[PDB]
Amino acid sequence: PKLILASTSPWRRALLEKLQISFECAAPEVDETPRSDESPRQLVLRLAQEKAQSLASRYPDHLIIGSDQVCVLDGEITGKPLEENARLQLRKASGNIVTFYTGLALFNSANGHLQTEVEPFDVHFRHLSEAEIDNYVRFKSEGFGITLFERLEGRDPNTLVGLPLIALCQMLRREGKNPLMG
Amino acid sequence: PKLILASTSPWRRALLEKLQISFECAAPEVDETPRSDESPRQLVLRLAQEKAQSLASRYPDHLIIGSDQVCVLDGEITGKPLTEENARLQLRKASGNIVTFYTGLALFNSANGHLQTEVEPFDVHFRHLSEAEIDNYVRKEHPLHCAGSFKSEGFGITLFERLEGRDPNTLVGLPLIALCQMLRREGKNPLM
């Protein structure tokens, strides 16, 4: 089965290219609005698998990857900021440990096999100033955002960038598609 | 530039660009040969310091960065394999094991002579690899000029169970979180 990435993120596309398996990107049709009861972990698991499953008709004999990421700023779920948004997020982060939750799903639309995983990554922020927050504004963990951090703690730095590649390699291995054998 | 990178590494240049502070590069003048009984941490501390200070006379009013990394497998410094045989040998030693990289960093301020040094570890936890996986990785990646015989930033992700360290940049070869701290201590915060 051919590989499909259910995302138009150029970040997720670039990450997946590291595995050297040919794939096609497709835009999933999913409402990402958190439900009131919903934990960060529940949300990204649900959205990861909905994104993958939503493409099953358009790509019916495929391995389909879905992923979703949020962070929590003082218990509160937060997605992409979309400029005054970006500033706010920094102010809450200062001096704190910020946990990102990244959900991942691999769906075999041929036989219906589904694998899911949620992987956290903790960003330990320096105590910042409004000056340096103002100066930074206007994060990018792979870039200039490194100036904001005390420590990054998690299984896989790729997860923080937005796709858990170690976890995905394992899911692919279960489906008989070890990137190392492709 | 007030900031100088004492390195001919193109990846250290690329990493330093992330801080968006003006700098230029110059080749350090040191002997990287390990001395008898020198430990990995001692070696990268020494070489980081030496690279930074070797430019003092050329850049006497500057903040000068030096860095050095070694790859350690079962207590021993591990070099570039050079051959496909040796690449497979290194990956066999890596399989189901932890490869530790030690990365030394120094910032020498030549104007006031302040020297700051640090060594930072980064642990790469490998999966248990088959001989086929090892053969296939070496054939695809040809990591013949990488110490440890894998590239962590790329296809090497297919070999790992987890990555453990303070800063992903350290593994690539420049401890940027640590360097930011050193730069702030000298009043050159990249955020300003």
Residue numbers in the entry:
A (entry chain B): 2 to 83, 85 to 140, 151 to 194
B (entry chain A): 2 to 193
Q: What does the published report state?
A:
Maf (for multicopy associated filamentation) proteins represent a large family of conserved proteins implicated in cell division arrest but whose biochemical activity remains unknown. Here, we show that the prokaryotic and eukaryotic Maf proteins exhibit nucleotide pyrophosphatase activity against 5-methyl-UTP, pseudo-UTP, 5-methyl-CTP, and 7-methyl-GTP, which represent the most abundant modified bases in all organisms, as well as against canonical nucleotides dTTP, UTP, and CTP. The protomer structures of the four Maf proteins revealed a large β sheet containing seven β strands (β1 to β7) with two α-helical subdomains on one side and one long α helix on another side.
Both YceF proteins also showed high affinity to m7GTP (32.8 μM for YceF and 30.9 μM for STM1189). Hydrolysis of m7GTP by the E. coli YceF was inhibited in a dose-dependent manner by unmodified nucleotides, with 50% reduction at 80–100 μM (GTP, ATP, UTP), which is higher than its KM to m7GTP (32.8 μM). The two structures of YceF-like Maf proteins (Tb-Maf1 and YceF) appear to display an open conformation of the active site, which can accommodate a nucleoside group of the substrate without any conformational change in the binding pocket. The Tb-Maf1 contains a phenylalanine residue at this site (Phe16) whose side chain points away from the pocket, whereas the Glu170 side chain is oriented toward the pocket and can participate in base recognition. This Glu residue is conserved in YceF (Glu154) and other YceF-like Maf proteins, making it the signature residue-3 of the YceF subfamily motif. In the YceF structure, the Glu154 side chain is partly disordered, suggesting local structural flexibility. It should be noted that the YceF E154A mutant protein retained the wild-type level of substrate affinity and catalytic activity. The Tb-Maf1 Gln86 (Gln70 in YceF) resides at the bottom of the pocket, providing the side chain-main chain H-bonds to the C end of the α6 helix and thus determining the size of the guanine recognition site.
